[PDB]
Each structure stands twice: as structure tokens, then as C-alpha cells.
Amino acid sequence: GSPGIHESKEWYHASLTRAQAEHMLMRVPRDGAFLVRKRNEPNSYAISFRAEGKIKHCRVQQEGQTVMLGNSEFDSLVDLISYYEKHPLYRKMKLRYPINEENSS
């Protein structure tokens, strides 16, 4: 809510090892979780998430006008996943796993 508009800090990564996220996503069997991280430049972001145990991230693009997460443009980084949070991202993912299998039952 308050913490998310423009400035954000809780799911996006931009300091710790980005590749280390894959080793942390494989330790969670049965569904993984949805996260994000920075790339090798301030002109492109990515989403690190996974299910089962086949870790896979994503690459969101951005232009000088609006951003393009995929089939929708949403210059807002939080609004981009805000509407897609309830809708389906890839052919099945849905950012519905904001935590690792441990106490979400």
C-alpha cells in the first residue's frame, strides 16, 4: 500500500548475489515464490520466481514512455505486478506465492 508506490523495498533485489536466488528457490519444493531483481543496467528489470523446482526468472523491459512487462504496458513497477498479481503472468504462474512452502497452509 503506502510502501510500494515508486520507491519499493521488500521483494525487489539489487545487492546480494542475484544468481544465489536460484539456489534459494531450489530449496523450496512444491511451488516456489515470486520475487524481482535488477539486471546489468538501470534500463531493465527481471522477476525471479519458481514452482516445483525448476527455478526461472523473467526480464521486464522499459522504454522512455511506459514500461512493458509483457502483453501490457505499466510504467509503474508496483502497478505492473499489481493488476498482474491477481491475473496470470506466464502460462500458469500468478505471483500468488509471496512466500516459500513453510506455513502457508
Binding site: E22, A46, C58, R59, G70, H87, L89, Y90
Partner: peptide, 12 residues
Amino acid sequence: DNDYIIPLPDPK
């Protein structure tokens, strides 16, 4: 090409 995917709601 692994460790990356496109957020598209459909098989295409």
C-alpha cells in the same frame, strides 16, 4: 535458454 521466462497469460 533457462532461468528466465516471459509473463504471458497463454501458450504462445
